Design a protein around this ligand. Structure first.
Ligand code: LNR
Ligand code: FE
Length: 308
């Protein structure tokens, strides 16, 4: 019977008791696996997320010198690419993040400050997330313009590599696009489409998410640039996605929704969105095909979903 979904923004608190308990940092393969200090630091951030409740300021954390060093390395190496490789919406907001959110090589921005900045731009807000949420819960938060965001940093031994999202990927990859109004409306439509959808459609929407929010390319006049968070936070793949090597296809959701992808190599193919307004309209149409015995609307005045 129709799977449960949150109907008020506060009900997202129910997700904390629904994450994968045995994290990536526990795999022998993890860059930080043999490091007990790293292991304890990850538990520390996991506890902060576990105890967080909607409405509370997100706890500030004093990052260690080793952690600020890893951030500085990632920030400085990626920043050189944005002006030529990132979509216009990214470069438009980046200077404002540098000025009001402290995006600078010597300092890791605190999530509370970034979340307040996002709220002023598009009403998106962040909440710290312990480990891996199911695709259903993760996509469901988007319906309320809530992005579940990691607060820990990748291990310092391999600054240019992370097998999982970390704070560098959230802040340099995702945050700038959530400041844009059309991208915000587009991400929210994916979220609304997921509410109470059957498991096999959640997987189709998670694939659409992967090919837009994480690895999407934008058409910008006669040029093509990157807006996917996974590209904007990957030095190597960001340069590769705008070269002659990968295959480019127009975003077509009935097609994108079932395309396979790997998470370990550079993507062999990417979908190009005409604009975020257009992608939003395509998602809205795709959502009408999802069998759900009802319709949903978000009411921003009360932060509640209305089930028709
Ligand atoms: N859903 C798979 C999980 O590894 C994931 C979800 C959303 C993201 O933005 C991401 O970077 C990773
Ligand atoms: Fe991501």
């Amino acid at each position: 019977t129709v799977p449960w979904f949150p109907r008020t923004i506060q009900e997202l608190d129910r997700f904390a008791n629904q994450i994968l308990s045995y994290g990536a940092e526990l795999d022998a393969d993890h860059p930080g696996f043999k490091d007990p200090v790293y292991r304890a630091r990850r538990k520390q951030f996991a506890d902060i997320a576990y105890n967080y409740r909607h409405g509370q300021p997100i706890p500030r954390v004093e990052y260690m010198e080793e952690e600020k060093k890893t951030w500085g390395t990632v920030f400085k190496t990626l920043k050189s690419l944005y002006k030529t490789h990132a979509c216009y919406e990214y470069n438009h907001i980046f200077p404002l993040l540098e000025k009001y959110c402290g995006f600078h090589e010597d300092n890791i921005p605190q999530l509370e400050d970034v979340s307040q900045f996002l709220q002023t731009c598009t009403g998106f807000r962040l909440r710290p997330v312990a480990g891996l949420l199911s695709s259903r819960d993760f996509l469901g938060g988007l319906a309320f313009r809530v992005f579940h965001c990691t607060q820990y940093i990748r291990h310092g031994s391999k600054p240019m590599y992370t097998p999982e999202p970390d704070i560098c990927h959230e802040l340099l990859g995702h945050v700038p696009l959530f400041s844009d109004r059309s991208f915000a409306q587009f991400s929210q439509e994916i979220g609304l489409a997921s509410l109470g959808a059957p498991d096999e459609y959640i997987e189709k929407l998670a694939t659409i998410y992967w090919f837009t929010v994480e690895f999407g390319l934008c058409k910008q006049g006669d040029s093509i640039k990157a807006y996917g968070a996974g590209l904007l936070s990957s030095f190597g793949e960001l340069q590769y996605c705008l070269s002659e090597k990968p295959k480019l296809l127009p975003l077509e959701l009935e097609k994108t929704a079932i395309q396979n992808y790997t998470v370990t190599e550079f993507q062999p193919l990417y979908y190009v969105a005409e604009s975020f307004n257009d992608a939003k309209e395509k998602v809205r149409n795709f959502a009408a095909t999802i069998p759900r015995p009802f319709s949903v609307r978000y009411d921003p005045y009360t932060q509640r979903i209305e089930v028709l």
